[PDB]
Amino acid sequence: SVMACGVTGSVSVALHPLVILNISDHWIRMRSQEGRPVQVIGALIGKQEGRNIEVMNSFELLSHTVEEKIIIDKEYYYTKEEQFKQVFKELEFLGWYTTGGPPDPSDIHVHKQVCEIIESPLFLKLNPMTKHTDLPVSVFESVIDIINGEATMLFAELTYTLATEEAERIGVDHVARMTSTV
Amino acid sequence: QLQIHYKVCYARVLDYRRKFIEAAQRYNELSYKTIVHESERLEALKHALHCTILASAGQQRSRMLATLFKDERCQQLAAYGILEKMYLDRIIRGNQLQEFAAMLMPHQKATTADGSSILDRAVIEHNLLSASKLYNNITFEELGALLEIPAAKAEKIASQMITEGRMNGFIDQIDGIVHFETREALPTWDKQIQSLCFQVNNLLEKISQTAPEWTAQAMEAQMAQ
Amino acid sequence: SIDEIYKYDKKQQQEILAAKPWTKDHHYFKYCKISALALLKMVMHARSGGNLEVMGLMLGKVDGETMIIMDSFALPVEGTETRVNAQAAAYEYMAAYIENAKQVGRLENAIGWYHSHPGYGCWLSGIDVSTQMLNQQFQEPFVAVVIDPTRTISAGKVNLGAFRTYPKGYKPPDEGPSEYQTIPLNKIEDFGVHCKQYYALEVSYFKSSLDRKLLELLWNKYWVNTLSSSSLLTNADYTTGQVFDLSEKLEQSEAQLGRGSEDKLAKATRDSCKTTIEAIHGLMSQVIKDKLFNQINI
Amino acid sequence: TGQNQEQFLLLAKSAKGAALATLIHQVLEAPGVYVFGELLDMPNVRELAESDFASTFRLLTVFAYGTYADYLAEARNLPPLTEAQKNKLRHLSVVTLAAKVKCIPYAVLLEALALRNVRQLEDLVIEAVYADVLRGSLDQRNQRLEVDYSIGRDIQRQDLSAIARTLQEWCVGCEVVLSGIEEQVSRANQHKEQQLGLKQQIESEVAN
Numbered sequence: 058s059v060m061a062c063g064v065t066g067s068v069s070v071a072l073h074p075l076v077i078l079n080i081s082d083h084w085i086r087m088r089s090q091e092g093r094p095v096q097v098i099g100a101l102i103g104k105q106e107g108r109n110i111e112v113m114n115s116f117e118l119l120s121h122t123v124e125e126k127i128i129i130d131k132e133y134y135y136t137k138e139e140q141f142k143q144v145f146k147e148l149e150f151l152g153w154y155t156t157g158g159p160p161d162p163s164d165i166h167v168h169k170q171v172c173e174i175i176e177s178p179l180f181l182k183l184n185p186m187t188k189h190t191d192l193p194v195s196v197f198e199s200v201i202d203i204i205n206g207e208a209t210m211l212f213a214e215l216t217y218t219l220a221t222e223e224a225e226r227i228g229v230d231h232v233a234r235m236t237s238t239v
Numbered sequence: 240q241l242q243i244h245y246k247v248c249y250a251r252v253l254d255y256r257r258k259f260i261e262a263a264q265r266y267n268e269l270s271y272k273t274i275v276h277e278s279e280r281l282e283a284l285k286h287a288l289h290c291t292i293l294a295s296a297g298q299q300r301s302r303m304l305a306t307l308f309k310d311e312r313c314q315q316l317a318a319y320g321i322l323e324k325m326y327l328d329r330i331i332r333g334n335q336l337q338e339f340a341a342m343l344m345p346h347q348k349a350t351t352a353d354g355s356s357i358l359d360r361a362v363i364e365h366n367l368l369s370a371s372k373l374y375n376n377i378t379f380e381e382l383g384a385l386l387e388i389p390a391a392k393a394e395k396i397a398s399q400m401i402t403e404g405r406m407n408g409f410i411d412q413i414d415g416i417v418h419f420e421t422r423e424a425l426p427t428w429d430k431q432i433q434s435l436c437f438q439v440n441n442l443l444e445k446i447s448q449t450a451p452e453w454t455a456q457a458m459e460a461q462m463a464q
Numbered sequence: 465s466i467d468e469i470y471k472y473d474k475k476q477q478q479e480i481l482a483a484k485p486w487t488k489d490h491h492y493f494k495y496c497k498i499s500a501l502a503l504l505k506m507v508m509h510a511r512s513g514g515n516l517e518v519m520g521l522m523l524g525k526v527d528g529e530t531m532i533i534m535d536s537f538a539l540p541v542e543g544t545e546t547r548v549n550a551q552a553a554a555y556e557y558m559a560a561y562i563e564n565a566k567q568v569g570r571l572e573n574a575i576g577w578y579h580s581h582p583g584y585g586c587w588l589s590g591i592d593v594s595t596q597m598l599n600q601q602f603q604e605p606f607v608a609v610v611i612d613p614t615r616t617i618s619a620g621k622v623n624l625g626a627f628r629t630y631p632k633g634y635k636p637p638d639e640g641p642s643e644y645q646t647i648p649l650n651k652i653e654d655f656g657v658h659c660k661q662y663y664a665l666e667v668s669y670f671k672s673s674l675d676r677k678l679l680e681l682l683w684n685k686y687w688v689n690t691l692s693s694s695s696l697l698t699n700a701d702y703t704t705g706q707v708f709d710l711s712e713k714l715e716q717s718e719a720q721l722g723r724g725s726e727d728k729l730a731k732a733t734r735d736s737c738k739t740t741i742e743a744i745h746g747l748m749s750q751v752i753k754d755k756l757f758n759q760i761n762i
Numbered sequence: 763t764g765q766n767q768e769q770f771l772l773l774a775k776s777a778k779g780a781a782l783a784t785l786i787h788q789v790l791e792a793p794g795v796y797v798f799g800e801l802l803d804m805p806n807v808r809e810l811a812e813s814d815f816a817s818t819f820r821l822l823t824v825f826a827y828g829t830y831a832d833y834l835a836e837a838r839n840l841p842p843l844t845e846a847q848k849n850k851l852r853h854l855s856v857v858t859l860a861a862k863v864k865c866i867p868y869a870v871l872l873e874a875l876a877l878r879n880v881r882q883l884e885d886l887v888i889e890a891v892y893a894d895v896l897r898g899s900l901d902q903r904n905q906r907l908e909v910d911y912s913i914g915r916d917i918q919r920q921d922l923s924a925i926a927r928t929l930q931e932w933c934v935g936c937e938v939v940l941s942g943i944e945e946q947v948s949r950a951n952q953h954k955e956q957q958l959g960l961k962q963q964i965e966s967e968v969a970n
């Protein structure tokens with residue numbers, strides 16, 4: 058269980074449910090194409106107001122595997138950024154997402170690559186094969202610590218709330234319900 | 240080693256040039272180098288922290304404050320108190336600044352006009368903004384007393400910050416009171432309801448975590464009704 | 465199988481595009497299936513425009529008489545609602561977006577365009593009709609989706625329509641119920657001129673098995689947001705704007721009674737009813753909140 | 763508190779009379795430790811009650827249940843406290859006031875915490891908000907403290923029922939609101955259908 062497991066950080070992440078559906082759809086579509094569950098990876102965009110981070114949208118990222126390690130295509134990201142900046146001018150790259158269980162060495166390797174793009178990226182993990190009764194979404198920050206003389210990166214989990222957008226609430230409710238004025 | 244000695248010198252030159260955010264970044268990077276002795280890595284971190292505190296207020300400085308606050312090693316530094324307090328938007332006392340000012344080199348105590356230092360003024364402005372988060376409104380006499388400045392200066396700087404758009408509020412000069420952006424009424428009621436129901440969810444999750452047996456036993460009773 | 469619709473069959477799509485059954489019938493396409501993802505993204509984009517019209521492209525496919533929308537994306541264009549084929553200015557961007565989408569496994573191609581009508585209902589204006597007629601002439605199969613984000617919020621129900629135009633010269637058949645919407649006086653003339661040049665598709669929504677699971681688990685915490693909505697002040701300016709319009713409508717209905725279009729007062733009465741009913745529903749949620757959290761004591 | 767609970771419970775199970783008596787003076791003079799429910803319920807600290815260090819147990823009882831005024835009334839019996847401990851007990855007294863009412867006037871605070879000027883009180887409320895004990899905002903003009911959130915201190919085994927007495931009072935409240943909707947919705951249909959029916963009668967008289 059190699060991660061931080063100590064003091065809290067920013068602790069102000071507001072997540073929009075659009076992002077959860079984006080990631081679900083990404084995983085469902087890749088699973089449909091390959092006929093088996095596939096780990097999917099992408100970018101998280103939104104706003105940062107001081108220590109409050111608002112995760113508003115997301116998009117799929119391109120990657121390759123060199124031997125056994127996952128490499129994010131950085132040229133693809135910068136191209137995608139030039140494209141999302143035209144329609145979401147007020148939004149910024151906040152971090153990345155992937156699917157699976159608790160964080161692992163591969164997630165740290167990729168997180169370091171994302172750290173080459175932005176200073177303090179968030180990491181969101183979604184478990185589409187959950188056995189439990191709580192929403193299988195977790196958010197993490199990275200901390201850089203020294204253990205036995207080795208300066209290493211670890212994840213620290215952050216608590217998060219769901220967004221309070223009225224139109225989004227009605228949309229989500231309408232989707233969840235799927236069927237007089239009063 | 241010689242290459243690292245240059246890098247240290249380069250950071251020091253930036254420090255001495257008052258390029259504090261750039262110096263802080265270079266010092267911070269030096270603090271990560273495992274080939275450098277632990278004591279000197281911390282000296283580098285301390286230099287990064289001091290330069291970040293002294294840096295001009297803004298996004299790059301705030302991002303570095305966040306980077307340093309996430310670094311557990313900063314808790315071994317005497318200035319951690321100050322770091323934490325500004326990162327968390329807390330009011331910094333004269334006494335705490337006195338000690339920090341004693342931690343600085345002469346060149347780092349640079350003064351703009353009539354003897355007043357950049358840091359003196361930055362701390363007042365930080366404290367004004369921090370006070371705006373504690374109060375809905377406050378008198379200039381009290382605000383001055385809390386910030387350890389004359390009441391006229393508290394009014395003048397508050398007035399400047401409001402005009403400059405760095406603080407939201409308005410001033411009543413006859414009653415001698417500054418009013419801070421309250422954001423009260425009905426939206427606050429909705430936010431308090433959210434806090435209450437979030438407390439409800441946390442309480443249910445903690446009941447299920449600490450005792451799942453009774454949680455299931457009482458969960459079946461809801462379906463029985 | 466809930467997830468069967470997510471399977472993309474390229475050859476089957478090519479076969480349908482080679483067959484072109486829509487050329488045999490101008491009422492061929494009757495249904496519009498929209499993914500929960502595309503709905504949410506379009507409503508979120510529409511709300512993000514505020515009181516200004518925005519537009520985007522929809523990615524999807526066809527299946528018999530049904531048009532399927534899988535995804536959508538915003539276009540960085542000016543002149544939505546004023547420029548015919550405003551989307552054309554984003555041609556280059558559309559080509560690159562789709563190219564990049566194909567790199568990450570988005571296989572569905574352009575199926576239509578969406579745009580917003582903030583506070584003035586779902587229908588096609590003259591400009592919209594010209595745009596959709598162009599799209600159906602050169603880009604068929606294509607559909608036009610219109611969303612009112614403002615009315616979605618005020619009514620607490622999603623305000624969306626899917627439309628297809630008739631070719632120049634072609635007349636619709638006998639049956640046209642036309643579900644009534646309040647149209648403001650600055651838009652009603654153009655609405656009336658073009659309302660018979662297109663038809664509305666039957667809209668339905670879908671989500672995946674995982675979406676289903678995740679939305680139930682989201683609800684286990686998202687219920688808090690339903691008891692803290694505050695809808696009366698979020699978009700207040702809308703109801704005050706509608707009342708202004710209602711007042712001018714009533715002025716015209718008074719002029720109709722003066723000396724001497726088909727009963728303007730009844731229309732205005734249904735408008736005032738709708739606006740008031742929305743307002744009272746807002747108060748209903750506020751009173752419910754007051755009953756639950758304030759009237760408790762020690 | 764959370765870390766300090768385990769950290770001092772580890773020492774509590776491995777300590778004797780005098781060491782526990784001094785440990786009480788160490789837990790009360792430590793930042794973040796505002797709840798002493800697990801520490802007061804220990805058998806090791808139960809031995810100190812009615813013994814050589816009884817006033818220290820009474821001091822722990824005041825810090826876990828009572829207020830600063832209760833300490834002032836029994837200051838001759840209770841052991842002396844430093845400014846940090848006096849502050850902490852004042853913070854907890856403000857929490858008790860905030861548990862009673864949402865908007866606390868300065869007068870009630872000045873009288874309950876035994877303070878002379880307004881800034882002392884304002885600085886104590888700042889120290890409270892900064893130690894994550896209270897949440898809220900101060901109003902100077904109306905001389906009132908607006909409390910947004912206050913933590914739980916008193917455990918109260920005997921008075922626990924009162925919590926349920928309010929919880930049920932909320933439950934019943936919900937049970938009314940729910941039923942209300944069920945009825946109103948029903949009425950909203952009961953009218954609609956009726957009206958439709960009536961319209962269908964009027965429309966049937968057009969043929970005549």
Ligand SMILES: [Zn+2]
Pocket residue numbers: 545579580581587588589592610
């Ligand atoms: Zn339009």
